[PDB]
Amino acid sequence: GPLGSEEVFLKFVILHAEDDTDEALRVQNLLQDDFGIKPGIIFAEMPHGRQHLQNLDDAVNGSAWTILLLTENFLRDTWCNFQFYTSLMNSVNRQHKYNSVIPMRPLNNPLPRERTPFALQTINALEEESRGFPTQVERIFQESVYKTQQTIWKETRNMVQRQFIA
């Protein structure tokens, strides 16, 4: 990756598509309030300069979890990438590392399991149309967890700056 670009202790990113970018946002919005999951920003809000935004890795970088807006397109989009890059496919293993992978389920966007990967389907996915929507939102994004993810990150800055730089 980079050398030492803008670094922030962001809470977590929300990977969404331009199709359901308002949906993923609609959540991140209630996220930083209902429970107080801040800071909260969407991939459509993520600023940049010389660097590109088409970095699915960025979302899987310096964070706690990543929202994977499973969509007919959003699927073939990244899903396609995966095939080209198993890098992301690794985050599908639900790495306990600082960053996590939490594939959220859209409500306005109908996406059955038949469209969901057996990997993201066998992982704790986020849901807003469920009764435990607030629960998972609490567990997944819980302070007790915000620490570990904060200690794993602050630590990831070592091994990297050591002999594992991006």
UniProtKB/Swiss-Prot annotation:
<keyword id="KW-0256">Endoplasmic reticulum</keyword>
<dbReference type="GO" id="GO:0060090">
    <property type="term" value="F:molecular adaptor activity"/>
</dbReference>
<dbReference type="GO" id="GO:0005783">
    <property type="term" value="C:endoplasmic reticulum"/>
</dbReference>
<dbReference type="GO" id="GO:0001891">
    <property type="term" value="C:phagocytic cup"/>
</dbReference>
<dbReference type="GO" id="GO:0071222">
    <property type="term" value="P:cellular response to lipopolysaccharide"/>
</dbReference>
<keyword id="KW-0333">Golgi apparatus</keyword>
<dbReference type="GO" id="GO:0031902">
    <property type="term" value="C:late endosome membrane"/>
</dbReference>
<dbReference type="GO" id="GO:0032481">
    <property type="term" value="P:positive regulation of type I interferon production"/>
</dbReference>
<dbReference type="GO" id="GO:0030667">
    <property type="term" value="C:secretory granule membrane"/>
</dbReference>
<keyword id="KW-0449">Lipoprotein</keyword>
<keyword id="KW-0519">Myristate</keyword>
<comment type="function">
    <text>Functions as a sorting adapter in different signaling pathways to facilitate downstream signaling leading to type I interferon induction. In TLR4 signaling, physically bridges TLR4 and TICAM1 and functionally transmits signal to TICAM1 in early endosomes after endocytosis of TLR4. In TLR2 signaling, physically bridges TLR2 and MYD88 and is required for the TLR2-dependent movement of MYD88 to endosomes following ligand engagement. Involved in IL-18 signaling and is proposed to function as a sorting adapter for MYD88 in IL-18 signaling during adaptive immune response.</text>
</comment>
<keyword id="KW-0963">Cytoplasm</keyword>
<protein>
    <recommendedName>
        <fullName>TIR domain-containing adapter molecule 2</fullName>
    </recommendedName>
</protein>
<dbReference type="GO" id="GO:0031901">
    <property type="term" value="C:early endosome membrane"/>
</dbReference>
<dbReference type="GO" id="GO:0034144">
    <property type="term" value="P:negative regulation of toll-like receptor 4 signaling pathway"/>
</dbReference>
<dbReference type="GO" id="GO:0005886">
    <property type="term" value="C:plasma membrane"/>
</dbReference>
<keyword id="KW-0395">Inflammatory response</keyword>
<dbReference type="GO" id="GO:0071650">
    <property type="term" value="P:negative regulation of chemokine (C-C motif) ligand 5 production"/>
</dbReference>
<feature type="domain" description="TIR">
    <location>
        <begin position="6"/>
        <end position="160"/>
    </location>
</feature>
<dbReference type="GO" id="GO:0005794">
    <property type="term" value="C:Golgi apparatus"/>
</dbReference>
<dbReference type="GO" id="GO:0005768">
    <property type="term" value="C:endosome"/>
</dbReference>
<keyword id="KW-0597">Phosphoprotein</keyword>
<comment type="subunit">
    <text>Homodimer. Interacts with TLR4, TICAM1, IRF3 and IRF7 in response to LPS. Interacts with IL1R1, IL1RAP, IRAK2, IRAK3 and TRAF6. Interacts with protein kinase-inactive mutants of IRAK1 and IRAK4. Isoform 1 interacts with isoform 2; the interaction occurs in late endosomes and disrupts the interaction between isoform 1 and TICAM1. Interacts with MYD88; the interaction decreases after IL-18 stimulation in a time-dependent manner. Interacts with IL18R1 and IL18RAP. Interacts with TLR2. Interacts with RAB11FIP2.</text>
</comment>
<dbReference type="GO" id="GO:0035591">
    <property type="term" value="F:signaling adaptor activity"/>
</dbReference>
<dbReference type="GO" id="GO:0034145">
    <property type="term" value="P:positive regulation of toll-like receptor 4 signaling pathway"/>
</dbReference>
<dbReference type="GO" id="GO:0071651">
    <property type="term" value="P:positive regulation of chemokine (C-C motif) ligand 5 production"/>
</dbReference>
<keyword id="KW-1003">Cell membrane</keyword>
<feature type="modified residue" description="Phosphotyrosine">
    <location>
        <position position="98"/>
    </location>
</feature>
<dbReference type="GO" id="GO:0043123">
    <property type="term" value="P:positive regulation of canonical NF-kappaB signal transduction"/>
</dbReference>
<dbReference type="GO" id="GO:0042995">
    <property type="term" value="C:cell projection"/>
</dbReference>
<keyword id="KW-0472">Membrane</keyword>
<keyword id="KW-0967">Endosome</keyword>
<dbReference type="GO" id="GO:0045087">
    <property type="term" value="P:innate immune response"/>
</dbReference>
<keyword id="KW-0399">Innate immunity</keyword>
<dbReference type="GO" id="GO:0034142">
    <property type="term" value="P:toll-like receptor 4 signaling pathway"/>
</dbReference>
<dbReference type="GO" id="GO:0005769">
    <property type="term" value="C:early endosome"/>
</dbReference>
<keyword id="KW-0966">Cell projection</keyword>
<dbReference type="GO" id="GO:0035666">
    <property type="term" value="P:TRIF-dependent toll-like receptor signaling pathway"/>
</dbReference>
<dbReference type="GO" id="GO:2000494">
    <property type="term" value="P:positive regulation of interleukin-18-mediated signaling pathway"/>
</dbReference>
<dbReference type="GO" id="GO:0005770">
    <property type="term" value="C:late endosome"/>
</dbReference>
<dbReference type="GO" id="GO:0010008">
    <property type="term" value="C:endosome membrane"/>
</dbReference>
